Design a protein around this ligand. Structure first.
Ligand SMILES: Cc1ncc(COP(=O)(O)O)c(CNCC(=O)O)c1O
Ligand SMILES: Cc1ncc(COP(=O)(O)O)c(CNCC(=O)O)c1O
Lengths: 398, 396
């Protein structure tokens, strides 16, 4: 065997599929989002506008977030210095968990290094807590969820994206005594569409299944307090477990689940992914807590209203140019190119000629043949760079 | 069908084995480590001394670490705002990766949210890159590694802890054409013992296997530049992949792997655990980079020398009291109680009566019947506090 040969092959394979990814090295200018310095491969520096980021509401530069982080650094230092069990549980962490519990109106919450870890650990550990559990998973569920669901051996059923009738057909065919869980997303990251929360809850209630919703692309942005789509539709009480991130609209890092005291205490107690890893830096927890707290206020609601507005304006302007934009009514604005190489070519031109950064999105992030640009207008994308983006797209489709 | 009934069952089972864990709520006093405020369950506040933390060298309060973190917050904000692919690759990450590569003298490095993620993602993704891979794993490998090894279906072979002859017997039995990888640790977290790097590398070279070493409890602390035990024994060139953390001796958060550019580029390109998660906050990256850079200098060497010294003094003083301490020559100082309930009882008393915090360690962190206290003397545990601790133990 030559390990080096096999590596080469593995990499070659990416180039052959047109899906080898080049990262763009940037430094966002705090206080001037969405401006960033792009560190070009030739050693030069160029001002660009970030159009694809997930700091959806500009919270990453918010003074109340940054103040709380500076404070915590000075009070307790750089990290926790331990796992939750061995000296890594601090007030910042439980203050954060209580903030999150409140958000989702749940008894408890549990913080992980990332929402990825939260899904992976929780979904796999649930198989252990509920012997013979059957997990029903939306075909476009995020990788973190897929990974959690398959991690431990056990029955899984994949239902066609947003297809509640297929869901019913699958669930009704299975052993009615077996514990069941349905896992889906409120907002799907790449299509920008909504999961049918009500219909799924109705099915879960009819068949005695647990509901597990990933609201990673909704928290901070939907509902009167930024608790997500289930809050918007008045459905939070119908959801057994929430999964969210602190890294996107909340502007910081980390993730969580929110659920009853029982569910949390059990996950907390049996999930290797939670037990065996250093807890989040207290500064990270301080920032995220401040972010959530802020987004619950009417001042946070202004940021949401502004976001929605800018998304509507961007979609209008792009349709007005005759462009391949799919509109499912969310803040995500995908423009489908359908080819991994041509997507990178359009992205490359936007970056270098117009200072427009929108990463080309390919497999495995989206299905092959659906490679796309994915715009994320935020409160800080004013009615003038929208103007700057559109003009560049127009100049470019010549 | 009845979900809560299952939950109460799973929880009870923890109380029944005595292994139900109560967390201790603390706030470390920056600039005064190892002092911390303990937030007692009754609402009171009490000054305590942290004796079980993993901020092994006090880097979590180091001014160069904190300065780099404050700077980054002001320059770029709270988080990256994206995955490495979608806007979260920054200069801070790239400089941090170069710093690590340099530490292990490797072509490349890759940063993950944690060393846990790095092990899990890497070990499981290697099965995909090397079809039919057989992984040989030390029986006391960390959970993160076990989890990475089992995640994807595929052949695994568990060798008796530190038993190189069992390793040989296993590997010689297997198909000689199959790709092989041996996964072990340089310093084992709970026993505080060293893995036999040279003997494992010899076996790996004889049978054409990859070597994967987890140096999580060694980086920053061993070798003339803090690169770990392999650096200390002059063996880094013989290790295919390094796994390390930025959250322990380095004082911050996150983890990584270090290997050749092709090895890194393939892991990066294939591992869902790397692709689908937000990149580390630039401030975290800045701090860790400053921490690694600092620990490579002669000034860092002073912190290591001091740590080793304090560990030796603690071990001496504990044996001089007749105590169940196992000494494998590392900075970790475990005192074996052997029972989960009595271990918590001793720990409780040390906290409440003496202001000594040392979490009681039980299953699944260590095998049942080997429950213990695990002391971690650092540069900041001056001869005064060591003297304080031993006196406290004695009277108990
Ligand atoms: C050997 C080993 N490897 C990896 C990890 C994962 O490190 P992260 O904190 O970067 O996720 C740990 C943490 N084990 C916890 C402890 O030391 O008690 C460990 O002990
Ligand atoms: C639906 C979904 N769920 C979970 C995560 C994981 O979140 P963390 O970064 O906090 O681990 C992501 C990130 N995927 C980023 C994206 O698709 O834009 C996601 O898109």
């Amino acid at each position: 065997m030559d390990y080096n040969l096999a590596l080469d092959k593995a990499i070659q394979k990416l180039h052959d599929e047109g899906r080898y990814r080049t990262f763009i090295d940037i430094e966002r200018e705090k206080g001037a989002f969405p401006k960033a310095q792009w560190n070009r491969p030739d050693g030069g520096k160029q001002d660009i506008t970030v159009w694809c980021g997930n700091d959806y509401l500009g919270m990453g530069q918010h003074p109340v977030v940054l103040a709380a982080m500076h404070e915590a650094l000075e009070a307790v230092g750089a990290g926790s210095g331990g796992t939750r069990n061995i000296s890594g549980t601090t007030a910042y962490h439980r203050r954060l968990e209580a903030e999150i519990a409140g958000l989702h109106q749940k008894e408890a919450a549990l913080v992980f290094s990332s929402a990825y870890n939260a899904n992976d650990a929780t979904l796999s550990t649930l198989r252990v807590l509920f012997p013979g559990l059957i997990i029903y998973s939306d075909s476009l569920n995020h990788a973190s969820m897929i990974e959690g669901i398959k991690r431990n051996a056990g029955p899984k059923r994949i239902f066609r994206h947003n297809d509640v009738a297929h869901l019913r057909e699958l669930i009704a065919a299975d052993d009615p005594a077996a514990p069941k869980l349905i896992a889906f997303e409120s907002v799907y990251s790449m299509d920008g569409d909504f999961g049918p929360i009500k219909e799924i809850c109705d099915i879960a209630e009819e068949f005695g299944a647990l509901t597990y919703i990933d609201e990673v692309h909704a928290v901070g942005m939907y509902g009167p307090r930024g608790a997500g789509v289930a809050e918007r539709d008045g459905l939070m009480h119908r959801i057994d477990i929430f999964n969210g991130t602190l890294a996107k609209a909340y502007g910081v890092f980390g993730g969580y689940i929110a659920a009853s005291a029982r569910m949390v205490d059990a996950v907390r107690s049996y999930a290797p992914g939670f037990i065996f890893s250093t807890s989040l830096p207290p500064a990270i927890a301080a920032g995220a807590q401040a972010s959530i707290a802020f987004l619950k206020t009417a001042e946070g609601q202004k940021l949401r209203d502004a976001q929605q507005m800018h998304a509507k304006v961007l979609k209008m302007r792009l349709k007005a140019l005759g462009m391949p934009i799919i509109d499912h009514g969310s803040h995500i604005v995908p423009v489908v190119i359908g080819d991994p190489v041509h997507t990178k070519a359009v992205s490359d031109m936007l970056l270098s000629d117009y200072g427009v950064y929108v990463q080309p999105i390919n497999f495995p992030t989206v299905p092959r043949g659906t490679e796309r640009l994915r715009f994320t207008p935020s409160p800080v994308h004013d009615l003038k760079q929208i103007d700057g983006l559109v003009h560049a797209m127009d100049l470019l489709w010549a």
